[PDB]
Design a protein around this ligand. Structure first.
Ligand SMILES: [Mg+2]
Lengths: 307, 267, 402, 307, 248
């Protein structure tokens, strides 16, 4: 078990900015902390790094203490926005992190071939863009086969081909068996590459689990577009007698609204019959879940399209 | 060791600072220029009090140009929060920065007073090479210590502030206070009281300014005139020997480095 | 030209002593016999404006209380008021009033003459080029000139090659030169006061003489000018407010901005306890005049204290006691009278102004103000100047202001 | 129409950095210029402003030349990564832009409420977050009655509620006749609100049109995520022989890349053969359509885990 | 007019600069402390005040306006401001009015408290000569500051980064205050056979710090050429700044 946070009520100034979460983490899963930019997310990310002390709580990273030197060799962190050393070179900064984490100096060349930076190595870091510094900032985090990544928005300022390819590099590390924690704020876009999500706000942890676990717990409407169907008949209105609201769209298509606890039965209601013929489902996404968990406790939605 | 692995960065980062290499070549072309003007006129106690005054203006300047953005320049640059998640302590990335920036000042004054020796042994014919090597060996291993004081001053004023634009304001304030304000407050205290404030306390007030302890070390053997000393003529009234004056310069490092570590430990 | 016996002298005492009554007289007069003639205060012996009015050729003549008026003006034939021949030894000229356009007292080749307590008002309209001398002395040994009042003559007390004589307490007002000295070896002068004069004291080529206690109030362009004086003694002189101006002729000196003391080729002399006050230049030391004992003076209020256009160092302190300087910003820790740091009165930029006058346009620049501070930090660029170790902290001339 | 770019060719030296672009933005639509960070997008974004001049063509912003003062009074703009004058206040900075754009002073306190900056107004600009300054830079772009907006990267550093609330403001604006332009790089999150995208490569303009027209032009597959199957490899071996690149995401989850003539016939083999706990069908997104058109003109795809 | 709407920004932004208010307080402290030591210990003290305001009024002007153009380009607001109804001239001239009235006020706290320390510590100073010799001093000290203000707009528009603007503003401050007159002395004391000293009253007109002192020392040229040569240093360098700002 990679990160076993168990019973941590972290306070400072007797304010309880992080109160009583029990967050596990698997050996290969890719967790996403999706809190606000306040007391929830960035406090809890510091305790896994061990640079913050857990007031009344045990944080057992990798089954060991969070501040041992034997576990910070097997850990990789990338902060939210870094401008490293604007007079140094590309290779030299990464060579400077090579001797610090204790990885071998042969690894510093293949990482700059791994991340597409060998065309821009041996150049001063003040000539790099914001994307290249994120490309460099990822490359230090992968130094010396890290068993726990910790990325805080690793996708900002980067080209969309590269961000798509970055999750492929994350997927190489998941199958290799490294638990990764993402801390993002661009939430539509990171939901296709996580296995679990931990949404926390107002200090406490609100909910946790996979995406299918959160949709099952939080009753949200779905969109089931089903074109190419039967006779535009009682097959349409039978879900209104089953407890739904079938929109009788014109060109032999229905958009049924369900409650998603009755989800898989409505699929085999049509797919068990002979007329699905290129249907399309539209689930509630991550932000529509993320809007909902604030409405369990916390803020209320805006007015006249403000904020 | 981890202290040398982070010293090797700052040794390779300070030498790419173009503002350093301007005023470290300025220290070299002035130490030749002072020693060349001191060679055509001869005298010996004027070329010591002017070289020690040259390193009073520049060795605090190179030290404060190096290390004003050592901690706060890494904090707002984001690379300090990353560095604490490496197998290090807060005591190793400060002592490592002190070794890394300290070897630059040990090389910036070995260039300066090294070429000053070659502008005397190749200029003053028949000079005593034994007295030259000893006097400029005392200049080399004491202008580093003056440099290491203001290096350790800059770690104090970088950990306390939290914005780099305000760190340059404090580093300019420390350079003005210790070099040419404390020498003028002590002058104005002696003139306006006409030397009758305290006949025993006022020479001990030189020890609260490391540039004045630096000038008192190099002007030990070559006293000569009094007007070359000026406010440093109080140093003849100090009953302390010369060996404690080395130790009072080293105590200005260790107090202002342990203060630099105690501020950085609760950053 | 009649004689003194051709008047009507009423004898008071029978020891060849006469007394002329009140009443005017006319023409020149000549003393050829040792007559100690006195005069009533209304005895205005007024000549007509030609010739030397009262010539004396006999020894031991005590002329007293006369009042002379309007003698000649021929400076080539020496139209004096009282001419004294070399054979007229030990003449006493006591308490006399003179008004006329020539020489007041022209003596030459005489010995031990005493010209005491007289008031000699020279002229008012002549351009100070033909007014004649106040007290002219030409190669006299033994003279004693005391407490006179010479006003508006030409070049004051002229003295030419006269060896042993005292000049005590004489007031000299609105003349060209105050006291002129020409080759007067082993002289002496005490407590004289010169006011509003185009040169206060001309000391030209006269050695071994004593200049003591003299005062020069508001003179023009030269307070005490010493040319080629050796083994002298300048003790207690008070030179105040030498303003600029010009003598109008520029014959032996030039026009100046105002120098309280100008030392030209004077090798050995002791210049102690003086007071040089509120002039433009406190002391001008030429390059040929070096190594003399200058200690104990007070250089107060001058806009520039020392002018020394040289590169030779010049210590200004005998026996460890120096001078009081008003702009001496020093302290005194060990409670003696002396300051603790030495005082350099001149920078390097204070001698660029003397060498090149076009830098006066640059004299208010910050770079010049930078260059004044760089000398105080780097003494290698300090040219060897006119410093004095241990300058005084208090005024040493506490009595000279009275 | 709002922006009618008729064949411009902007060039710096002799290199044509924008070769025969031809846009036509309608007056009620929301458009997105998606391109890489080189000379494709950011030269074209300045030609709609008055900052450059077309070396071969002409633009017509609102039927006028783009440098008239009466044009720029109804044209907001928001650049990427703007930090304002840090010693000023939040209110006074907006009041400074109020007098410059000619908007009345009563509209300043409305827009400070409209972006949710009223609690943090009348404070220093230097004590603002990155997301807080982006609220301010939006708040100046709505000044007056802006008939054209150029929101270059509007949602960097914002909260995911605030990101979701910003496009709520946008959808009120495009119904008010005020056509806007997005220039983002985060492709999911803008794809729900782009009315017609204008994806272009480094050199030229590749393809424009709606999301329906792009998926009709580009025959992209669909993604079928089946969450909660029994075994992984027995299902993973079934589709890789059937001609479907299938991966594994967690302990029980797969994805299937269909051809949409396969999507109907494969989906029955999940509910029928086996029982998944959840089924999610993704349409080919803007993130995947970007990969197509970059492969149509630009580089080759990167190797398996590199960028 | 929009030249004033952007000038009200620079008043509010310049007066909250912590670096400016530190130097402007130190300028007012050093202006009384020179006036304290010139009365207790008027042409003798207005020349020493001229050496003070030649040190600091270029330094005050270069602290205000070294980041006027390139500080807005790095902040991204310069690219935003050009999309407003604004020419490039009205931004520059509006910054010159806004930054100009700051050091036109910094001499009114600088010499407004220095003339207070003279008119209330002499008691019989004859203020009719004071208010014309200080009226000529406060006018000529702001116009000297407007030269280095216009110099800072030339140097801000040329560079592309904020670090090299301050590296050049220190270079402009060294050259025009205390290197040009030191290289005037080196042409005097080391060259006399090939340096005509009659040419030297014309070379003071190539330096606005030198033209500043010549209108506090009243001289072969009259007064009216020096006022028209100080305004020509503003008007050429502002026209040069407008010519550089149109080439970004
Ligand atoms: Mg003493």
């Amino acid at each position: 078990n990679a990160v076993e946070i168990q019973g941590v009520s972290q306070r400072y100034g007797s304010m309880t900015v992080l109160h009583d979460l029990n967050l596990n983490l698997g050996e290969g899963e890719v967790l996403g902390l999706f809190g606000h930019n306040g007391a929830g997310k960035t406090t809890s990310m510091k305790l896994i790094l061990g640079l913050l002390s857990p007031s009344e709580g045990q944080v057992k990273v990798l089954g060991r203490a969070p501040n041992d030197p034997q576990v910070r060799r097997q850990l990789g962190y990338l902060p939210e926005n870094v401008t490293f050393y604007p007079q140094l070179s590309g290779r030299e900064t990464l060579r400077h992190f090579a001797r610090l984490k204790g990885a071998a100096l042969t690894q510093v060349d293949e990482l700059l071939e791994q991340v597409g930076l060998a065309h821009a190595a041996d150049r001063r870091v003040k000539t790099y863009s914001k994307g290249m510094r994120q490309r460099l900032g990822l490359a230090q985090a992968l130094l010396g086969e890290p068993r726990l990544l910790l990325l805080d928005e690793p996708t900002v300022g980067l080209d969309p081909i590269a961000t798509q390819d970055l999750y492929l590099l994350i997927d190489r590390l998941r199958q290799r068996g490294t638990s990764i924690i993402l801390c993002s704020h661009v939430l539509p876009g990171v939901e296709a590459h996580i296995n679990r999500a931990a949404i926390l706000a107002k200090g406490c942890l609100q909910a946790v689990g996979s995406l299918s676990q959160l949709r099952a717990e939080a009753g949200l409407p779905v969109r089931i577009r089903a074109s190419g169907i039967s006779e535009r008949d009682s097959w349409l209105q039978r879900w209104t007698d089953a407890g739904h609201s079938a929109r009788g769209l014109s060109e032999s298509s229905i958009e049924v609204v369900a409650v998603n606890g009755h989800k898989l039965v409505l699929l085999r209601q049509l797919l068990g019959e002979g007329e699905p013929e290129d249907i399309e489902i539209h689930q509630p996404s991550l932000e529509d879940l993320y809007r909902y968990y604030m409405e369990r406790a916390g803020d209320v939605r805006a007015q006249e399209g403000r904020l | 060791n981890q202290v040398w692995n982070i010293a090797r960065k700052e040794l390779s980062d300070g030498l790419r600072n173009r503002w350093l290499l301007a005023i470290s070549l300025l220290f070299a072309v002035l130490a030749v220029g002072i020693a060349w003007l001191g060679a055509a006129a001869s005298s010996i106690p004027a070329t010591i009090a002017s070289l020690a005054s040259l390193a009073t203006f520049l060795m605090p300047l190179i030290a404060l140009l190096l290390a004003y953005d050592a901690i706060v320049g890494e904090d707002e640059g984001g690379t300090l929060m990353l560095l604490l998640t490496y197998p290090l302590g807060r005591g190793q990335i400060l002592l490592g920065k002190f070794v890394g920036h300290g070897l630059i000042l040990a090389l910036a004054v070995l260039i300066g007073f090294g070429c000053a020796a070659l502008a005397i042994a190749l200029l003053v014919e028949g000079v005593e090479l034994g007295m030259l090597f000893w006097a400029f060996g005392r200049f080399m291993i004491s202008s580093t210590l003056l440099g290491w004081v203001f290096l350790a001053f800059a770690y104090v004023l970088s950990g306390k502030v939290n914005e780099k634009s305000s760190a340059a304001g404090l580093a300019l304030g420390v350079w003005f206070l210790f070099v040419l304000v404390f020498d003028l407050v002590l002058l104005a205290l002696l003139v306006l009281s006409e030397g009758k404030f305290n006949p025993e306390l006022l020479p001990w007030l030189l020890l609260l300014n490391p540039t004045d302890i630096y000038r008192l070390i190099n002007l030990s053997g070559f006293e000569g005139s009094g007007s070359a000393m000026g406010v440093l003529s109080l140093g003849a009234d100090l009953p302390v020997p010369a060996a404690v004056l080395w130790l009072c310069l080293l105590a200005w490092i260790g107090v202002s480095l342990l203060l630099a570590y105690a501020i950085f430990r609760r950053r | 030209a009649p004689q003194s016996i051709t008047t009507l002298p009423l004898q008071p005492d029978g020891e060849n002593r006469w007394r002329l009554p009140a009443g005017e007289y006319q023409g020149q007069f000549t003393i050829e016999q040792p007559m100690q003639l006195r005069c009533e205060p209304g005895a205005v012996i007024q000549s007509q404006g030609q010739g030397s009015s009262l010539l004396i050729s006999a020894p031991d003549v005590l002329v007293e209380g006369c009042t002379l008026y309007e003698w000649g003006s021929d400076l080539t034939a020496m139209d004096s008021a009282v001419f004294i021949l070399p054979a007229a030894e030990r003449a006493q000229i006591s308490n006399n009033r003179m008004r006329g356009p020539g020489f007041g007292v022209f003596v030459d080749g005489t010995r031990d003459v005493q010209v005491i307590g007289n008031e000699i008002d020279g002229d008012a309209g002549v351009r100070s080029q033909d007014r004649g001398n106040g007290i002219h002395l030409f190669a006299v040994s033994g003279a004693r000139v005391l407490h006179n009042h010479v006003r508006n003559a030409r070049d004051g007390i002229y003295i030419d090659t006269s060896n042993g004589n005292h000049l005590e307490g004489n007031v000299i007002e609105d003349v060209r030169y105050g006291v002129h000295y020409m080759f007067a070896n082993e002289n002496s002068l005490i407590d004289n006061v010169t006011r509003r004069t185009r040169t206060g004291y001309a000391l030209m080529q006269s050695r071994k003489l004593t200049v003591t206690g003299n005062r020069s109030e508001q003179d023009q362009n030269y307070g005490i000018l010493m040319n080629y004086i050796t083994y002298s003694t300048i003790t207690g002189n008070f030179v105040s407010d030498v303003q600029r101006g010009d003598t109008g002729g520029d014959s032996m000196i030039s026009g100046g901005e105002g120098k309280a003391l100008f030392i030209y080729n004077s090798l050995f002399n002791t210049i102690e306890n003086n007071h040089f006050e509120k002039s433009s230049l406190g002391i001008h030391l030429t390059a040929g005049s070096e190594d003399n004992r200058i200690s104990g003076n007070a250089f107060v209020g001058n806009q520039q204290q020392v002018k020394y256009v040289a590169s030779r160092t010049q210590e200004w302190s005998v026996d460890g006691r120096g001078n009081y300087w008003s702009d001496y910003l020093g302290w005194d820790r060990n409670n003696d009278g002396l300051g603790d740091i030495a005082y350099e009165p001149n920078d390097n930029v204070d001698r660029l102004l003397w060498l090149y006058p076009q830098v006066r346009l640059l004299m208010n620049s910050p770079s010049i103000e930078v260059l004044r501070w760089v000398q105080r930090a780097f003494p290698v660029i300090k040219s060897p100047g006119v410093q004095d170790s241990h300058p005084l902290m208090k005024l040493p001339t506490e009595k000279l202001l009275t």
